[PDB]
């Protein structure tokens, strides 16, 4: 009704002052974005919200557009805008809202979150370390390191100990336990054998990226296993309408032998007789199953639960990292508010800060006892600064050169004050340590070039781009001269013998896409390039004559 | 080469079909070397080389290596104009809704999903999940869920539940959508949804669904997945002086997209939480939005400045856009301007071109001549010759220029006479010399104006200038056929001084033998130029079948009358020069010469008139002195009487006998009346003088005073400015329009003191401030009109329709203010004109009513002729030459082809510039009233009409309005009206009224006049009103032009009975289409659909154009383009503005034959 | 590289260089016309691979390539005055020329 009255009063008036809109727009609205959207829609209506009343002639002259589909759409938006009050358009307001939804963290809470992340990654550690091919490939990595295909510190960052000698002794102890456990699954204590092997390894430590590689190895292993499960069951569940109970009673529990499928065609059921035409692909799937059972160190189901416990640890630690990042988003915003006017928008600063804060959260250790802020503030501010130095100028200056520009500005801002008028570049190079040419090029580095739509202005309302000329064009007089010279060259070569003409057309690039060379020319004339040189020289001497090249003389410009 | 433009939504795959490579890095150039980067917006692999036939690094530097792709940088060696053509693309890491199909008002995504705009925006900016095919689980498709609600609904539902939020949500809503299936369900509901809003929006939606089906578009293409990249040379980063660069704003927006997209890929690869990735997606959304159309979100992101960046939608729209002043208004070569001077010796067909401008413009022609004649060996030698400006470049200039027109154009081209082809006459100096009789067309005085000369380059353009625009072809105003070659001020004063007798000059009452002897007598000084003599005159009268019989007699004329008779051609009578010959006498002299003899004798006559006027005006010696302002002696007597009257009225007012404002009115009236007496006294003192005489007695004759001779010859001035010069100045206004009641009792022969000179400043500054701002928007009415009447062209020779308006005189209460012969001249009759004897076919039919037929018509006193109108032409997509008339710019009939719509727009706009710029009420006037007239706005107080015919009857009493019903003599009366009792009626309830008749009184809304009475009624209404204004100020413009504008106005039809046709009922259709449709459907065994004719104001009618390349010019480019994309429209060009834009001939002028032959091919 | 204010200008043929003194600048006292070289400046550039028949032209006349543009300051067109004055400004790095 209210805003409806406003719309109808405008549409009968043909205009609207800011005052009338203010009187008629609702009173719940506090921000100016909903108010400006209302003004935009109402102008689209359209009624042209103004500041002052229009003249009597400005009503008649002002063109009226454009009914009326947009009329209906605008009215149906305006009738609804008055109801929902919290509506907003800025991504920053939405971000601040959905970040204020979380509750801040406390010191002991940060200790809890750090220890929980450590527990999750430690569970992942144990699940991976209970994979024997993992330690086998790790010993192979260290061996190919010992063959100097890598570094004794590159492959892994030492162990949980501070010299590589004790490390290599740990390697030898690991190899001894490995030989005493791996060829000794003769199961009663080989369980505790591989337990002890993984335990003695757990004091060790590898580079993170190699450990991620091991993670992906186990991932692909379990994935091929479960995809054998997929092609098996989906070709029994949907290709044979298999009740899952038969699956759980045959497949689960053993999961390896051919009793649950290859002894599953004698179940005295119709789908069991269907399973013949699905016995080939599922039979090969059991083949890959048993092959990977050999390729697991144990059965398929045990490695299933191993990678499962790994996944449990990974999900726990990931949710923990998430909770820490959610808590400290406010810290990231507080830091990013310091850089808001150096070329990058506010949300971009916050996003770079969030990436850096994730990186710091991955590196936090509460064994020391410092505040999380005191550590992560470093990574946050570095992330934001590199972001501004990398993606704030249109023409990208490398980071170190931008540090040099900041230093130049600092020293100049100091020296002009202390020295009087201004520092001449010799004076800066003296005060600085630079060689005074580097300083001059640093000065010459352009800055934030300009919008080519800049006014000129007021002469014709022509932006700057109208006066920047194209210097790559062959102006029509130039092309005319070019083709005139082309025709003249043709009509000169007409006055040469066939040999001279061919050798001069081919030795130069006339009417062919080369630029033939002397050997390739004299191939067609059977000369060893010396007589061909002589023939070129004779033709050039002949055309050199006046009364044969007066026109070609005129083509010379000087 | 194309014959049509097509448009559609761009598929992601097709956007990769255009691309030459995916831009990944944000960088532009190297900052040190300035080389393009490997994946930046300015790449060499993606967008091609930087120098011609030369790879980036430089391994391949031969044109023989053409087309091969280098190995060290992958930059294929081509021409670097290829870099102005190649697009790239950006693989968006998240779908991002295209802002045009979302934030446009109807919101094609919203009205296509059948979803509210705010709801989609909530799903899009990550407020609320949306159900996207949630199975059978009681979930509602397109039902929003909130965050907490989505969680708890997922509780108890581990099953899919298929809910998504973000742009991917809208993309999965559109992709899943079945369009024909929804068309089927909406047809089935439109079957049984017979209520207005429901079935209304049903049909309004099924229209867009069927359209999306036909256009080939897929609904989900409005969600961008790939993003195309404008090529580098359309958004350069060029260096300015001193290491300085200048970029486009487009590079900034592009970098913003690339950065945020790369960061989003990073966030996804880093497994960040939901808050961060959601916020990154929102940011990418706003970045892509700002890139496409900066400002629809709010707020327009600003650069390294306070102002917003310019974007793609900005790169097309706005007067700084492509359509406005790069698609029509272009800078042109072979052209140049200078400062015009008189050059009064030229003929009407030539212009003095300076030798230096002529040697610059005609450069290639001169080079060709020097190398053709052998004077220059090659083009370089000719270049050096004409650079030195040797002695033979001048002979070559004379030869080249010889028959080669130049177009002269002055800045406000209000009409087509602001461009004329002239033959160049080489002159010294640097000023263009412009003929005197051409300034009226150009609106050019010689106090510093400048003219632009362009050079026609082709034979076809040389023949278009010579045959069409040559200055001796255009001599009649295209708005009204009166000649536009009227001699202006020295000419008319010459012809007035010479053709103006006095009572006793030298040689009175000699009988000369003829004009030769009168001239020989005057030039030897034996007789004076105005000395009444009997002279023997032989005049030739074509009183015959064009036979030109001679007749000699003995007239009584002055010596100058007969000296001037020597220049007048044969067919003209002798009474044409036997009077004083002021201004109108000369214009009518040229006019009768044109109506008798045609164009060649009239051009010759015009030149001879200018020559003799200037010669005998110089011999006139007509100076201007201070003793020429004869202040009347009875001026201070009259002012004493008026001052006494104001003193008496002030004494009565002081005694309470009058009020204050009453006495103000009285004193303003007293001063206006005394001013009238002083002006009358001074002009009666100035307009006559005493002189002696044959017999010796004093005798009064018209004064030879110079100020009066200039005001009375019509040469310059008038008795009002004369009054300000010697009479008193009068009362002066203020800017408000009030009148300062302290008059200016002084003149300019006397002085004004400081106070009166201050008081005059008020009105002076007001008038100048208005004239300075009228100059700003000088051509807005012309532009508004050429928006709607542009595509109208004379395309046919005869339509055959017998419809026609009845042209008759306009009797404005008393006498006629415009006779029938004037309103009817040039029109083609629609039926046989019977003699007043009512059995004699006076003018049979289809007879171009020229001056012979028009005189025959006024002679018989036949005063109502049925003429064919442009508004009643049965032609489709055009007008015929018979329903149009004659040209009025050329005496003949219109040619098949002539673009009469643009002629009509300019013929109404240019004459409108002589009207007041602000509306004044007396019948209002001024230009704004005319613009409102053509906008067909509804008057607030409509005199209500009688919608149906029958017995009048009333009804209920005062339900707000007194109610009435009209009930037919035999028919039904379902129409009743809520007549306001404020609308004080005109007819009692007991007088049966015919349909279409007045009920109340007041302004008649033209819509109701059109709907009640014929289209002829609305057209006569509009022409009579607008011509009321144009005659109010005294301006003459024909009715043909208003009629063609109106025919552009009422060009929409609304269908009542859809018949056996294929038209929806409550639909508006281009009337020219529905006409052919019902004609065809009635051709076969069907019946046509009957419609109600509509009417639209010009700004509303021009918004409904069949094309979209044209409609994106004068409209909002964004809405028009969004609509055309979702409609899959194709522009088969067929227009003027579209063919201008796309760069081929228009179908209007000489291009008509080209388009006819092309239509022959396309139909073969 | 840098550009020089030299008088050893490309193709222009020892008449346009008549006004210029040794350092390349016009004399204070000369009356130039439109086109005359006030300050002769030669700019560095690359080769740019002159097309054949230009290769053949310069091979027949032996007039080898310049490598240096003639981007000098010549009087605008239509003006014809006396050169009443000449000021020179050399940055502190650039040494100076004879006219300076
Ligand atoms: C005319 C225009 C005003 C627009 C209102 C102003 C605004 C920005 C100005 C340019 C920039 O400063 C860059 C550069 C700096 C150099 O040192 C001197 C040259 C340059 C090209 C300047 C010329 C001119 O002065 C510009 C175009
Ligand atoms: C005449 C015009 C003002 C008109 C109002 C003046 C004022 C500053 C001038 C520009 C600057 O010099 C910068 C730049 C230098 C390049 O080298 C040539 C182009 C530029 C854009 C110049 C063209 C023009 O000359 C400008 C716009
Ligand atoms: Mg002027
Ligand atoms: Zn290369
Ligand atoms: Zn017709």
Curated annotation (Swiss-Prot), chain B:
Its cofactor is Mg(2+); Zn(2+). Acetylated on several lysine residues in the presence of glucose. One of its GO terms (molecular function) is zinc ion binding. SUPFAM superfamilies: beta and beta-prime subunits of DNA dependent RNA-polymerase. Binds 1 Mg(2+) ion per subunit. Binds 2 Zn(2+) ions per subunit. InterPro entries: DNA-dir_RpoC_beta_prime (IPR045867), DNA-dir_RpoC_beta_prime_bact (IPR012754), RNA_pol_asu (IPR000722), RNA_pol_N (IPR006592), RNA_pol_Rpb1_1 (IPR007080), RNA_pol_Rpb1_3 (IPR007066), RNA_pol_Rpb1_3_sf (IPR042102), RNA_pol_Rpb1_4 (IPR007083). It catalyses: RNA(n) + a ribonucleoside 5'-triphosphate = RNA(n+1) + diphosphate. Its EC number is 2.7.7.6. Changing residue 764 to T/V: Resistant to antibiotics salinamide A and B. This is DNA-directed RNA polymerase subunit beta'. The gene is rpoC.
Swiss-Prot record, chain C:
The lineage of its organism: Bacteria, Pseudomonadati, Pseudomonadota, Gammaproteobacteria, Enterobacterales. It comes from the Bacteria. Belongs to the RNA polymerase beta chain family. The chain holds residues 846 to 945 of 1342 of the full protein. DNA-dependent RNA polymerase catalyzes the transcription of DNA into RNA using the four ribonucleoside triphosphates as substrates. The RNAP catalytic core consists of 2 alpha, 1 beta, 1 beta' and 1 omega subunit. When a sigma factor is associated with the core the holoenzyme is formed, which can initiate transcription. This is DNA-directed RNA polymerase subunit beta.
